[model samples]
Target chain A: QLDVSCFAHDKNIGSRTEQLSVVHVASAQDCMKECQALPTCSHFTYNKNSKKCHLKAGAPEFYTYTGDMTGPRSCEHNCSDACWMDGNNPLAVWDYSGQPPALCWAACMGTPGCDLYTFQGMTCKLYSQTS
Target chain B: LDVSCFAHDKNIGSRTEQLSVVHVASAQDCMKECQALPTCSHFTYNKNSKKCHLKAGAPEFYTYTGDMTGPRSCEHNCSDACWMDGNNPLAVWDYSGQPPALCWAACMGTPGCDLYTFQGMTCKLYSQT
Candidate 1:
């Protein structure tokens, strides 16, 4: 039931008015997870090269058009359910046992081509196709 | 980006790689401290006693249980601007020797703040909701 949007890369989306905090993480997925944990976080910029995640308190102030924008674009963090697990397993399955459903989702999201996952009982599986 | 939830334990099954135990006002504060430290990757926060046990390395598996346990990556860094000081009369005045609007420009250019007060050759930059 969660309607989450993907971040648009290299958009330059303008600088923000206030910067709430910053942290170093492994990937854009990790950066989003950090933002979801904080109540103050609204948007964020993840530098793919530096692995630096810049969390913003609110939306950007303004945007400017420019060529050759560097780094990952800023985006809002969104989540609905704990996991996408349903009663069905329609795609390739990877075993993830004794781990929280969140971790499984992170694993899939972190992967370059992964899209969805399922967790049942103590077992978790990932799928390339979201639907 | 990806979003994930934290796993909480209400019993004694916690990690033994204890780095430090500190008293904090709230679990959020403890979480923030854990996120701030580079060495910390997991922690146990006692809700009943407000004790935050910071730990290095991943959380270790245990047979017994009593306290909450989760990865330290759960904490987040949001917004670069924070309130430094409020309602102070000290101001940076732009004397004739300095360029006009230089202080204002500096304040605007600053990443963390958008508003500033300038008088007496001093400028104080800050942000408001």
Candidate 2:
């Protein structure tokens, strides 16, 4: 069986530092799956030692005005995820694994009218309802 | 106001590629301003012209299989508008004189609901009520 520890709003790690949190994951592949499942998890940091995965919100820097390159340069070379030739892309595909189920919950003590969404895959996503 | 004519993809750019359309007082100011906006991800450069296209979008890449470090040398740096040799270009903010105000207008001339503009920043969109 897989061992899991559920820690939410623990004072040690603190709450919502720049919409990011450090988590422990089983593997890098697991981290990717978890992040992909999460809507708010735009980026993540996974530690091989303790198998901790940190989920972060917001955009990661890629380039500098000076023409210096940054981030995963290869990913930029790959096909753009936002644009696909057809509707078969992973972003548009939603099977909802069923066992875990997709659930949406209101956020705790941050931006008002915001909600944290989650899927059966243990992915935590965030969204705002207010316009 | 000088409108420069540059030939590029006007429509084939598509919804996937087009973002960050703004004009600042100078090239440097525009670049910095673009970096400040949260939505920008990456940008393009017009090799022939000196225009620095600023883009804003989601934080992408910069990570791989648990190893987390600055993905590249230039990642996370703010887009600075200035000559590479340290010459500060003439920068200006056009909407500097206006005080914070909320303006309402019918969204896309639609009835039932109007757009809301707070402090000169027009509400970009609004659904009909």
Candidate 3:
């Protein structure tokens, strides 16, 4: 699922764009994964220099600078039948010291409305809405 | 929408996730501020406390901490056809100094977007089953 070849880079175009959410991620692949999991994310801008992922709900009106990668390629997410994993943007965070990823998933699944979850390095966050 | 003085301490507190805060003269004024901001779904007003905590997400249940809480009224004079108050800020796309109809139209046009909130021109849309 690492094929980001379908996406194109639009440089310096975020000034006029309305950002839905911004998160910190490790790589373009991780940014893509986060974008694809959110139903509201229509496009995104990834800053290579800052390691920041800016998700947008719509396209910007103008184009700006360079060094930033902008694209419309939806990442192919392979979520389990019930839940999707986000690399960033925790809905509700809790310390999960020695808990396994499965335990985090189970905790979210057990909640009345939890639909998405992310588990990373002792942190478990549960989200009720996953569009 | 009319304000209710239930005073039962329905104090659900404000959402840990918030958009902004405003200091008002009274709880009623606090409610009005929330009503004006489209992103504000719920708020906590401390009676005679001059604090209005405007919030943006579905309130997670927690023990009471002594404040009054409730859903903000949609006083934007929107038509009944519009569901202007939403619990979550699914995707904030644009801010406009227009009427609620502008936001409602945008939501209807976007695929998978079903709900919207408009506050001081900020339009936030969300999708729900």
Candidate 4:
């Protein structure tokens, strides 16, 4: 459970007025948790590379620091596509029935030349190329 | 004087922590920055990008091209190293990172720098008088 639903994207807002605090954390989720625990905190910025969570007291709007993520439209992704065309560039197929999307994604990453995959109808289809 | 040394082509700061970061002209110059900052113990330099990463704590050494790292000291210390750039060679102005014609340039930067020995990215200025 989280206060902000869309903490997935790098959607950012900038403010210097009401910074709550900065904490060292491993993920944006942890940053959100810190904000959730605080009464004055309304927004946050997470520097993924540095693993720094910036807790803020004001609005998440205006300003930009590229490496900082403010939660927006980025896919819950290592590599994922919004749409798929079936029977395109299939190199391997397996039944990952009743498994999480992460497992499918994991398998694709471990395999050589697995550029993409689709987990549908409890089956995973791995692709070698995008086209 | 600041005690210092350079590790050419060796990347450090694997801990992913830092005291500060600034752009510089070269790795030798980066070492100069680390020496100037009191909190800095060691530093890493990206040769291609010319970004100096000044670290507050110790770092792990690892081999990576286009990057260099080293420590600065207040104690009476310097463990300097040099490697052959291309062939058997010999100095004027000193540098802390890798070199070629850049080795020649550092000598030019120094007033009395006439002779230079460029070894393992460490360039030094010399004048036989």
Q: Against the correct fold, how does model 4 do in TM-score?
A: 0.27
Better of 3 and 4 by DockQ: 3
- Model 2, range B2-118, lDDT digits (tens) per residue? 112111222111122325554444433443544565444332333234333443322122212211111011222211111111222121122122111101111112232222222
Model 2 misplacement above 4 A = A1-19, A61-77, A80-131, B1-129
Across B68-105, the per-residue lDDT of candidate 3 in tens digits comes to: 66556523222111212224545665533333433443
The lDDT for every candidate, in the order shown, is 0.45, 0.27, 0.52, 0.49
Point out where model 1 deviates above 4 Å.
A1-131, B1-4, B7-9, B63-66, B75-129
What are the per-model DockQ values? 0.01, 0.02, 0.02, 0.01
DockQ of predicted candidate 1:
0.01
* Residues forming the 10-long window of minimal summed lDDT in candidate 3 chain A: A78-87
Assess candidate 1 and give its lDDT.
Answer: 0.45
Write one digit per residue (lDDT tens) for candidate 1, span A1-131. Answer: 11113434455433344666789877666776765676655445666556667765543333433311112122221111111112223343444344455434433433444444445443434444333
Q: What's the residue-level lDDT of B113 in candidate 3?
A: 62
- Residue A33 of model 2 has an lDDT of 59
Give the range of the ten consecutive residues with the poorest summed lDDT in model 1 chain A.
Answer: A77-86
Docking class of 3: incorrect
DockQ of 2: 0.02
